[PDB]
Amino acid sequence: TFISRFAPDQPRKGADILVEALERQGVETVFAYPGGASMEIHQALTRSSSIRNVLPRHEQGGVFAAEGYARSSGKPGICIATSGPGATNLVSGLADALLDSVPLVAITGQVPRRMIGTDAFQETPIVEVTRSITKHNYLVMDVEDIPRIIEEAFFLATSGRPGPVLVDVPKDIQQQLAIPNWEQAMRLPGYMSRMPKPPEDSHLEQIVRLISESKKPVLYVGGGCLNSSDELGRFVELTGIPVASTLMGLGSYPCDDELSLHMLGMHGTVYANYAVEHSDLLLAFGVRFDDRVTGKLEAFASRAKIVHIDIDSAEIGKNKTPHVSVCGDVKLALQGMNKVLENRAEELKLDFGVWRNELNVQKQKFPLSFKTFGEAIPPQYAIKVLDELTDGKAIISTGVGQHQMWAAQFYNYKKPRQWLSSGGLGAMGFGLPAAIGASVANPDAIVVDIDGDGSFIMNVQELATIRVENLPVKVLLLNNQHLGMVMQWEDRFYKANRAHTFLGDPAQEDEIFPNMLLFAAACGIPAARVTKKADLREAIQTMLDTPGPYLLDVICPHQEHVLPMIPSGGTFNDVITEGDGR
Amino acid sequence: TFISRFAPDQPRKGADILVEALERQGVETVFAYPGGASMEIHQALTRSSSIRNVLPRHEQGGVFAAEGYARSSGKPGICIATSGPGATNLVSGLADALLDSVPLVAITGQVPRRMIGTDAFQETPIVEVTRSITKHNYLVMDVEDIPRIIEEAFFLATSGRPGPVLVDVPKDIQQQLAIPNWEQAMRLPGYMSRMPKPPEDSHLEQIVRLISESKKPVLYVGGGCLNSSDELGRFVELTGIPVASTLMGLGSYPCDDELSLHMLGMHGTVYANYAVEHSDLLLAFGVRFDDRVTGKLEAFASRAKIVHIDIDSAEIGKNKTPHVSVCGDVKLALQGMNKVLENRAEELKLDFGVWRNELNVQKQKFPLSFKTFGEAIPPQYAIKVLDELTDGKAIISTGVGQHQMWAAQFYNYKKPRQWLSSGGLGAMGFGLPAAIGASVANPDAIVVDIDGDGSFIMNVQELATIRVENLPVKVLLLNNQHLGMVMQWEDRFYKANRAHTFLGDPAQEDEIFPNMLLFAAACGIPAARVTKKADLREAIQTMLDTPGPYLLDVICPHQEHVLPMIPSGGTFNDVITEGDGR
Amino acid sequence: TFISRFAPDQPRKGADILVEALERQGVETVFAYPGGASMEIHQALTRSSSIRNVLPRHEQGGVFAAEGYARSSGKPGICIATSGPGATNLVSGLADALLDSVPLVAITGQVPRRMIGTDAFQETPIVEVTRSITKHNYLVMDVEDIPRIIEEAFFLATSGRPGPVLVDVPKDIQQQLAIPNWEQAMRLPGYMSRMPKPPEDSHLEQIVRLISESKKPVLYVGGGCLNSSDELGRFVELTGIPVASTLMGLGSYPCDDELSLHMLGMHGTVYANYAVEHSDLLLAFGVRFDDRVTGKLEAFASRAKIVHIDIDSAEIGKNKTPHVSVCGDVKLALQGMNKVLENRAEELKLDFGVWRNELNVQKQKFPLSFKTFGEAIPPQYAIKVLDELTDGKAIISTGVGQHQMWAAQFYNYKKPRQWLSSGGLGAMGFGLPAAIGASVANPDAIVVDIDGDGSFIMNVQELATIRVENLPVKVLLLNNQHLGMVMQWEDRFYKANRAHTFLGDPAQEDEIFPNMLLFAAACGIPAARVTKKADLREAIQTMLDTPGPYLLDVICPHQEHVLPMIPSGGTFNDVITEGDGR
């Protein structure tokens, strides 16, 4: 089926074998930045006709772009870097992909094998450095292993709990000629023996039993449900259970639905956190009970039976002890429970109307809100407008901070893989590169990077990439001249004592600095600024309608605070529902 | 002597103790970027009146700035970052400082101790990740240890072979109140017992003996002599031995001297490599026999007695076996040998005229050269002009690549700590941030970042820092629209097959992309472009004369090749003396 | 040349491949103790007709036996153990072989690959546990790798600085059928590129030059000269330089020679340490400047030029900085220097008579001595008698402690590999098992284990092995009822305050306990006790003349102290020349 480019008997460079290994894996896009130790790989790349390379302007841009690609497609993201500084520049991206369980394969060039450990030119023990921040990694010591290792890396990166896998390839092995064997079996006995088996009916039935026995059930959906959109939807219509979501889970279930409690956690809706606080049954599907969501574990869902379905046994009972657990694919568990619910429908007659109403009162007494001052643009409102003009069908990538929280709160994601945000590590500068990868993976989609002025500038150099690659990336920059999230904490806990959180120029306190429009101009990307709420709708519309890349610099008052807010390690009773930096 | 800010009996936050620990170390500048896990530290920082913080726009910018500070002052560079992504963003900087032996202390915030290892919000096992890329690191587990650890870190970072030391500080320890004990003794028994003792006279005399017994002596000076400028100078005038230098050693001995053979190695002068190839005595002072300099070890200084003086015993005999070694401070060894040479002067009567002439013929037959095409600006010439107009008294930081090599070849450094360049790791994007640190450390000096278009854009966001901090940083951008060094290798070894090395826009092949002038404009930094060699001198003069930050975009023909060049693992007989990409 | 036992096309069990891998390496003897995880290997072993297995009674016995085999033959020692407790029981042996640089290959069975890391029955992470105590180790993950790994292990264990290498073999791989490929190339690029090249003449000549320039030269020979007996002898007759030896070097040069200064160090002869203290030239051949020999480094050979020839660059300049070093095989360096010395003989006319005499006076004023009390047997005397009756042609293995020191002091080894003693780790219980291995490796030699009552009892179970294997092992047990070496230190530094150092029974203080004769009897080994010095000579003679295994229990007064003695970290001026525990 697969048509190679070399005679089955003809030897080729290890680099060429590495590339075919990728083509055989179905790879079409890679984000690679050339360097000495990886020249061979880049040369082999130009010989390929099925793989396109998107040359970033910084290796970190490459990884984040690969993450965006993966997060938006469900496919693994592939980035390539040279040795030493090339490799080290991927570090934040690997840690990010590992904490968020993003399928990713990173390939780094290395100095020749005999040069390893000798403090050679541009060498860093990347395998040692990245061991604790990757799902697994390798150091190829023989051209003969390229096929097997590449296959193993992709398998590991995509199976079970997705994650990053780094493959270190010495330069001498890239140049070595050999005849590849694509038949080699993978050496993953332990891992493959540990892969969860499909859920047992006895287990799934005890859950449906608990559901029928409950009066206040609540779904706690997370990043693990990204591929179970349909299964989850069907499940909710057969049980009528309200759905609360983590930041990683946004989109698994449409935020624009009466059964939707939206996001829970530190900055979750009052009603979402309320439902969990007063639920008797908590269905934790594809979540990892993070401190951001639980606060004080003792108080979290303190009065309810917890069911936890996860693909990683290491997560079940890590922070919260379930009453019922299922180690396996949530997508399968849902399909199974759906059948049962579908059959015993009549004898079940599930009705959680009273619960939903008890919640709908909370959803009405404590809905998400934002104040509007004069003609100042409310960031929340801008996002709300973006949602409207894009009909909630846009892929949104973001930076980290207040804007990120608002992008999560005030936009309704119809489906998963529409929300691309760094949640676990919370790395700034993720938004722009992520958008690049998402756009390449989704050429027809509307890709909007809702960024912050602090996050945007960190990888601003990727604007060059966007232009040269001609990607229709739209940038909705919520410029507030500060490191918002941190200044909010300065206001709440440090008597508003500013400590290096102002990003503008002290010499011209009232001048917007820097002038993001000029960064755009430098890379030939049309841009415009907005300051009055009145002409914001027209502005955003322009950005959307203008073909190609576009930067809309939206000026916002910095005293805005993300609400509501449950302080760290707090309880639902510590939730802050009002205030700002005024 | 030291006046604190807290009553000796009054307890203060661990964060405040950490800051005083810095003040007590003599720290005046730190490059810190605020984050959740480090808020306390930033707050404590604002209470300090002796320490100023330079807020970068990216943690990588912070480290590189700290490196520039250190490299240009001889003082340790201090950078601070928050946990998770903050910490991971320092990685390339730590690896860089370790490979180049740059004194640096990095402080990173961490999640609360009880949260460690739980996959907490923004946590990364930074100590584990950085163990192989730092001289040493710590995880503070008790506020009581702040004083001792900080003292130990600075001691380790600055003593012996300088290097980076990272201190991980959990957030709960930053908030804990305590009364510091500044009297605690350091726990470095092993290290301190291993510190080299001053050189023995017997050893130093055997060297002076070898010198008198030689006919073709050659000094091989490196980064280890940065603090022995005077001792080295005196030594050379007492022996009259020609001085070859590594890229790290530039400036230890004035490049503008008849006894100077300039740089040796891969891109070293033909005469410098010649002298080493035909020397009978090689005086390796403060060097680590890197592959860049030696090529094929067997052939390197194959016909001569090698004397190696290093402060790190692990380096003596690592790649080349000396005939005589001295493990200690080269500065002391020079002072000792100077006395001997000064006394036995008459009975010695050292005269290496014949050798120097044999070399001066090579220096004349094979001098550094560059061709000039029409009115196209020769990068070499631009640097030569910069040297002239600044009277070789400017501090030069650079990126990595061809421009870096030219900045090394065509500028005469009068003293050490004038040349700030990433040599071991060779990390791109180093030039601009390094200049920031150098300028802060040297407010009166002329600081010029000779960058490449590829390297410059990686950390272009630091332009905002330069403006806001009002630093007179001059940027001599040698724009060639490509990743020069890599394209040169494409030309020599890959039939000029371009593989992702073009940095401009393929849609407008002839248009300079991006427009670096606009990046400058965005951060309110005056800038101008130059294309004709005729008005280059006036341009550079303007840049220098214009008060404050300035960006001069110098357009160069990309077919330029750095010469001469000894291919990797090659011999002096493989030296390439001509050719380009035309 | 090699005749297998399976058709080149016929697949066999991995276990069978492992065994042929050994046969192909020239292995004839292995010391293996069967266990669950290694049954397959033992079965494959019985199919072999060239390899004999010596079943010990404890895995520790197996390793020590393998060490004895290696130490006495120059061949690598092979031991095999099962997983878990089998493997952990080898630990002391591996550490021992690593510290003494003894070529050894240890093979351990492991649980099936899929069971690894699951806390399986009898599984221990042996590769992780032994990483810091072996030269290198492996975990076989594919039957296909057996040939390559075994070849690599033997190569690594025997080349450069000899050491132990452990190969962990999962049980499922032992059972897997496959067709071995004995043509596979080893993957040791780094190591093989680092292997020292033969010494350069320039280097060797500078040494001969130093020798002619010296007046008080002293040879400091160690374990590295074990294979240079002849080269060393010739060297000494061409230079007439006195030879001092480390405990590991005994035998490299005949102790019974006027040019012999015998052992130096803590318990070295006064004259040996004197010569080093007052030498102007120290020729350190195959030594590692251990604290036992140097004491206070500053004072060690403080007034002399140090030449250090070692096969491990990591050792050159580790504790002492040489004035001249040579990283390579001492055997080759000697052959080279011998030629030079042989030619420039006349023009050299080396004469160190004055030095030798200055020493011969010391050798006469401070010779090794021992007092004789009534009819009590002096341990020193017993060993002296053993030497006489065996004509110094016996292979001597020992335990650790006073007897060990006396066995070193009062016996003249004619050749190397006659002295088998644990020097670096100094592990008790080594003597008996080591003798077993030595006897198997040297069926015709006289093998005598000079043991202590404390050391002997630790692995007394190996007596069963000696009997069943019918090995002519003689045991000269110097029974002093105490842990001698420790009690000596109690006397000198703790006011003779006994702290658990008495090995007899407090209930019968005057009764010899235990009765070692009965341990012998239990394993059917003839034994006899001696208490009177008068009938000691006849006793030892009997032991020697009685065919087969024999145990001679020699009772000695415990107040004996090993002398002379230079306290730890002391100087030659701190040498203790008299005293005991009376």
Ligand SMILES: Cc1cc2nc3c(=O)[nH]c(=O)nc-3n(C[C@H](O)[C@H](O)[C@H](O)COP(=O)(O)OP(=O)(O)OC[C@H]3O[C@@H](n4cnc5c(N)ncnc54)[C@H](O)[C@@H]3O)c2cc1C
């Ligand atoms: C400024 C800031 C504020 C934040 N505030 C909030 C907040 O208020 N609320 C909030 O929710 N988050 C918040 N976060 C994000 C937060 O850090 C965590 O990233 C997020 O809560 C993790 O959610 P998750 O556990 O659902 O997803 P993940 O972290 O992606 O974990 C998914 C889990 O699902 C499992 N799983 C994966 N695939 C499958 C499958 N097929 N079948 C079954 N199980 C599977 C995994 O192995 C894992 O245990 C914030 C982050 C930042 C940067």
Ligand SMILES: Cc1cc2nc3c(=O)[nH]c(=O)nc-3n(C[C@H](O)[C@H](O)[C@H](O)COP(=O)(O)OP(=O)(O)OC[C@H]3O[C@@H](n4cnc5c(N)ncnc54)[C@H](O)[C@@H]3O)c2cc1C
């Ligand atoms: C594109 C590129 C091309 C390059 N081309 C070249 C080239 O052609 N030529 C070249 O020289 N380099 C070149 N390099 C730089 C090169 O990689 C090495 O960084 C450089 O050769 C190292 O020189 P060094 O050993 O002298 O300094 P360092 O690497 O700084 O090593 C200094 C040494 O001195 C010792 N020492 C430190 N302090 C003291 C003291 N007080 N007393 C005694 N000893 C001390 C150290 O412990 C160490 O062993 C290039 C790099 C790049 C990025």
Ligand SMILES: Cc1cc2nc3c(=O)[nH]c(=O)nc-3n(C[C@H](O)[C@H](O)[C@H](O)COP(=O)(O)OP(=O)(O)OC[C@H]3O[C@@H](n4cnc5c(N)ncnc54)[C@H](O)[C@@H]3O)c2cc1C
């Ligand atoms: C109770 C007790 C008391 C002790 N008292 C003393 C004492 O008083 N005096 C004493 O000497 N020891 C004493 N020791 C032994 C001591 O601990 C050390 O084991 C011994 O000094 C090590 O000697 P070595 O360095 O010569 O040999 P090794 O430790 O075997 O080291 C040999 C060295 O030679 C190098 N080498 C190996 N092969 C070659 C080759 N082919 N060419 C060149 N170089 C090579 C190695 O790599 C290494 O650096 C005592 C031990 C015990 C248990």
Ligand SMILES: COC(=O)c1ccccc1S(=O)(=O)NC(=O)Nc1nc(C)cc(C)n1
């Ligand atoms: C990182 O290099 C190594 O892998 C590396 C490290 C140590 C020794 C040899 C190599 S190498 O000989 O295999 N390749 C190169 O030296 N490449 C290279 N060098 C320069 C200077 C500029 C460019 C573009 N490529």
Ligand SMILES: COC(=O)c1ccccc1S(=O)(=O)NC(=O)Nc1nc(C)cc(C)n1
């Ligand atoms: C990285 O945080 C931790 O150290 C961390 C990690 C896990 C649990 C608790 C903490 S914490 O409670 O000690 N601090 C914060 O949670 N800080 C914080 N959080 C947000 C969301 C925005 C800002 C500015 N600061």
Ligand SMILES: COC(=O)c1ccccc1S(=O)(=O)NC(=O)Nc1nc(C)cc(C)n1
């Ligand atoms: C250590 O065992 C394992 O390797 C091991 C460890 C976990 C699971 C399976 C095995 S096994 O199934 O491959 N072999 C055995 O279980 N062997 C064994 N068991 C007993 C009880 C007594 C003897 C003699 N052999």
Ligand SMILES: [Mg+2]
């Ligand atoms: Mg902001």
Ligand SMILES: [Mg+2]
């Ligand atoms: Mg360029």
Ligand SMILES: [Mg+2]
């Ligand atoms: Mg005893």
